[PDB]
Structure formats: structure tokens, C-alpha cells
Scaffold this active site. Structure first.
Site, short mmCIF file in Angstrom:
data_model
loop_
_atom_site.label_atom_id
_atom_site.label_comp_id
_atom_site.label_asym_id
_atom_site.label_seq_id
_atom_site.Cartn_x
_atom_site.Cartn_y
_atom_site.Cartn_z
N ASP A 180 0.83 -1.19 0.00
CA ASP A 180 0.00 0.00 0.00
C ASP A 180 0.86 1.25 0.00
OD1 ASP A 180 -2.23 1.61 0.14
OD2 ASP A 180 -2.23 1.62 2.34
N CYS A 214 -7.24 -2.04 -6.23
CA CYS A 214 -6.39 -2.21 -5.06
C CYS A 214 -7.32 -1.94 -3.88
CB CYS A 214 -5.16 -1.33 -5.15
SG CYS A 214 -5.47 0.42 -5.67
N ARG A 220 -1.96 2.01 -6.69
CA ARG A 220 -1.44 0.85 -7.41
C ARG A 220 -2.21 0.62 -8.71
NH1 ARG A 220 -1.33 -2.86 -2.03
NH2 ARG A 220 -3.10 -1.44 -1.59
N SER A 221 -3.54 0.71 -8.66
CA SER A 221 -4.37 0.54 -9.85
C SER A 221 -4.00 1.53 -10.95
CB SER A 221 -5.82 0.70 -9.48
OG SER A 221 -6.27 -0.39 -8.67
N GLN A 261 -0.69 7.76 -6.46
CA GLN A 261 -0.90 8.41 -5.17
C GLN A 261 0.37 8.97 -4.56
OE1 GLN A 261 -3.55 5.18 -3.31
NE2 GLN A 261 -4.21 7.09 -2.30
#
Length: 298
Positions: A180, A214, A220-221, A261
Site C-alpha cells: 500500500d 487495489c 497501485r491501480s 498516489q
């Protein structure tokens, strides 16, 4: 050239500034349906919502809302559905969406438990003999087989519409070592996984859009879809220099907020695309090199 830009950014140490530029330029569209009171328990994170214009609507009359966005990359001719990790009360909605959108693959980039907390419901069966029935959406889901590698697992699932008794094969691609707010262990391991998805047919235009998630479905996506789209664009004209990673990411952010992110996810995105370009430009042997370097056996 992305590679020259990369070295320039690296030498000046400006990844954080570039990344903040992207955040400031990114589109801002309304997400009024996501914010309706009746949908509060359908969102995992208060500050991650689908825009109204690109949200996936469920084909049901009670409540068509799911936290999922269609990312339609016109120039690349590939679409993706990005969604959050389903909640206990939305697992049925999730598979309803897969059915209605005719997806062949589901790409999961998170673990169910991360950093001591539950990031995703256990939304698929772990044992062949214990199928799942989602009574709200009239679907049944059975594990058919699994192929467990060292850092990812591929599962073959059977999804059945209980109303009609039609069945479809769904392929589940589970990346299990991607932290994450972090990055994959290496460009090779990520690209080996991405090519595994590609070689299954799940990203192909004869199928509905692949479902990528995710926990929130943006970090991550976003990294997965950004690298894939950049490589596809390069493939189209065999012209690496024609691809502007930052502009691609801003286009994607027209369809879902927050994609990528962290500045380090951005930097990883560049590395993955630069390395993947070796394959696109005709060095087929690099695929096998990534498999070896990823240490996927055992």
C-alpha cells in the site's frame, strides 16, 4: 524522450514537484451520486469517489451505484474499469458489474490484510468445494483452479448467472507483494505480471474492460493502467518518443480522481515503461529475462 526527462528529473531531485504539478492540473468533475446519503456504505474511503460522468452503473433499478470508473483511453483503444476493494455489502455488486460489463479478467493489486487492517473483502472462493452465492445479484462463483507463484497467483473462476444459467470464465490475477502506497520490488517483476495479464486475453477488445482494483482503486491501480497504456501507445506506431507519460496520466485522471498516489509511484511508472519499451521495440528475449529476474517459481 521519457528516458532523458527521467534523468533530468532524477538529477534535479524534482519528482515531488512534478507530482504536485500533476495534482494541481488534474481534472475536477462532480461526484454527486457517490456522495448521496444512501450510498455512504458503498464507499470504502470518504475521499475517493467516481466522477458522475465516468461511473459504472449497475443494471438494476433499486440502486445502480458502485464505486467504479470507466477509464476509456481513446487514442490507445483500451478501456479499464478501476474500482475500490469491495466491501462486505458490495461483493454482490462487484460481480454484477463484472457480468454486466462482460469482463474477462480481474486484476487485484492488494492483499486482503495490509498494515494490520482489512483493505478488501474476501470476495472470491479460496476452495473449489466451497463456492459462493451472492443472493442479492443472483450469481454464483466457483474456484476452478489456481496457479500460485512466488509473488502472484492466477485463478480460474466460473461465474454463473443463476437467472439464466449462462456461465463465464473469469481470470483473477492477484499481485501479492505490492505494498500500500508503495511500489513493486522491481520493474521486472511488475512487467512480468503485466505481460501475464496481457497474454491471457483479458485486456483484449473482444472482451469487456478488465477490472483493476487495489484498496481505493487509484494508487497501485493507476500505476498498472498507466504503464499498460503507455506501452500500448508506443506499440501502435513503434515510436517511444511519441509518448508523454505525464499527459497520459492527466488524461486518465479525467475519468477517475487521484490516479498515482505518490511521487515514487510516478517514478516507478517511468521505470516500468522505459524497461518495457525494450520488448515493444523488438527485443523479444527480454520477456524471459523478466521472468527469471522475478523469481516467480516456488
Amino acid at each position: 524522450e521519457m528516458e532523458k526527462e527521467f534523468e533530468q528529473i532524477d538529477k534535479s531531485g524534482s519528482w515531488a514537484a512534478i507530482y504536485q504539478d500533476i495534482r494541481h492540473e488534474a481534472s475536477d468533475f462532480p461526484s454527486r451520486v457517490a456522495k448521496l446519503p444512501k450510498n455512504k456504505n458503498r464507499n470504502r474511503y470518504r475521499d475517493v469517489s467516481p466522477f458522475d460522468h465516468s461511473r459504472i452503473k449497475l443494471h438494476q433499478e433499486d440502486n445502480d451505484y458502485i464505486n467504479a470508473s470507466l477509464i476509456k483511453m481513446e487514442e490507445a483503444q483500451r478501456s479499464y474499469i478501476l474500482t475500490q476493494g469491495p466491501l462486505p455489502n458490495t461483493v454482490g455488486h462487484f460481480w454484477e458489474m463484472v457480468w454486466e460489463q462482460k469482463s474477462r479478467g480481474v486484476v487485484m493489486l492488494n492483499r486482503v490484510m495490509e498494515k494490520g487492517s482489512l483493505k478488501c473483502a474476501q470476495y472470491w472462493p479460496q476452495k473449489e468445494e466451497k463456492e459462493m452465492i451472492f443472493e442479492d445479484t443472483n450469481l454464483k462463483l466457483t474456484l476452478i483452479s489456481e496457479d500460485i507463484k512466488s509473488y502472484y497467483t492466477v485463478r480460474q473462476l466460473e461465474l454463473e448467472n443463476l437467472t439464466t444459467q449462462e456461465t463465464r470464465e473469469i481470470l483473477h490475477f492477484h499481485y501479492t507483494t505490492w505494498p500500500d502506497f508503495g511500489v513493486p520490488e522491481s520493474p521486472a517483476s511488475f512487467l512480468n505480471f503485466l505481460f501475464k495479464v496481457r497474454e491471457s486475453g483479458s485486456l483484449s477488445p473482444e472482451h469487456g474492460p478488465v477490472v483493476v482494483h487495489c484498496s481505493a482503486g487509484i494508487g497501485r491501480s493507476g500505476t498498472f493502467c498507466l504503464a499498460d497504456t503507455c506501452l500500448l501507445l508506443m506499440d501502435k506506431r513503434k515510436d517511444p518518443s511519441s509518448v508523454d507519460i505525464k499527459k497520459v496520466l492527466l488524461e486518465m485522471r479525467k475519468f477517475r480522481m487521484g490516479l498515482i498516489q505518490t511521487a515514487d509511484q510516478l517514478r516507478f511508472s517511468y521505470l516500468a515503461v522505459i524497461e518495457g519499451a525494450k520488448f515493444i521495440m523488438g527485443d523479444s528475449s527480454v520477456q524471459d529475462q523478466w521472468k527469471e529476474l522475478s523469481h516467480e517459481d516456488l
